[PDB]
Amino acid sequence: GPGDQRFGDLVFRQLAPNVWQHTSYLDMPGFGAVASNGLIVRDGGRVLVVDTAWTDDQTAQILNWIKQEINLPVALAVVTHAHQDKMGGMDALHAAGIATYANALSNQLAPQEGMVAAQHSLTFAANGWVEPATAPNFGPLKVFYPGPGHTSDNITVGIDGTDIAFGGCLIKDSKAKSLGNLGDADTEHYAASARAFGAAFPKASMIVMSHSAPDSRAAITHTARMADKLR
Ligand SMILES: [Co+2]
Ligand code: NI
Ligand code: NI
Ligand code: NI
Ligand code: NI
Ligand SMILES: [Zn+2]
């Protein structure tokens, strides 16, 4: 290979010829730098972004890395729930003219979570799939609401043309010792929601998540099995 690229305070790992993971870091007192991962997808003369970094300035650095390494307009960004690690850098997307999308419920939750809402709301059909009219130009991003889990609003994304699915903070890796921050969790539905994400992207073999390296479908099984203990 070539290694994972460092650009300002971020790290970018290429996962497929048109997909990269972005990683940004925040110090949390007690246990050092906490990585948060999102995605970057090159499609049909544009770039799509999934999740912000923790901060505006870090998010502005993602845009700069895109401009330097890819050099295609960012058509849109989708954010996967209203917490700092996924939505902390909304202001930087908006300053850069980028159309932003989140679950309607994430936009309703954003103020109480201290987040800036996306500019557009996604709504989801009864079977969990995004309503296409509310997700124009998403191209290969297939967006699915699996039910409440890590938060009430958490949504997940598959990348058509690849073996990649992104569970965001709903899914922990296959050796995680707990389900992490449950302050906003739905402990009743968590397990079913994790299993629904797995059934929605049944062919995905690389599962990207918010706080560690990409794992296999074992991350989904282990997560659901941990969530079973909560209900
Ligand atoms: Co801000
Ligand atoms: Ni608009
Ligand atoms: Ni419909
Ligand atoms: Ni229910
Ligand atoms: Ni396990
Ligand atoms: Zn979260």
Swiss-Prot record:
Q: Which positions does UniProt annotate for Zn(2+) 1 binding? A: H81, H83, H150
| EC number of the protein | 3.5.2.6
- So where does Zn(2+) 2 get bound? D85, C169, H211
> What's the cofactor?
Zn(2+)
Q: Extra notes? A: Enterobacteriaceae carrying this gene (identified by PCR) have been isolated in Sweden, India, Pakistan, Bangladesh, England, Scotland, Northern Ireland, Australia and the USA. The organisms they were identified in were K.pneumoniae, Enterobacter cloacae, E.coli, Proteus spp, Citrobacter freundii, Morganella morganii, Providencia spp and Klebsille oxytoca. In India most isolates were from community-acquired infections rather than hospital-acquired infections, indicating the gene is widespread in the environment.
Subunit and partners: Monomer.
Name this polypeptide is given: Metallo-beta-lactamase type 2
* Upper taxonomic lineage: Bacteria, Pseudomonadati, Pseudomonadota, Gammaproteobacteria, Enterobacterales
| Range within the parent protein | 42 to 270 of 270
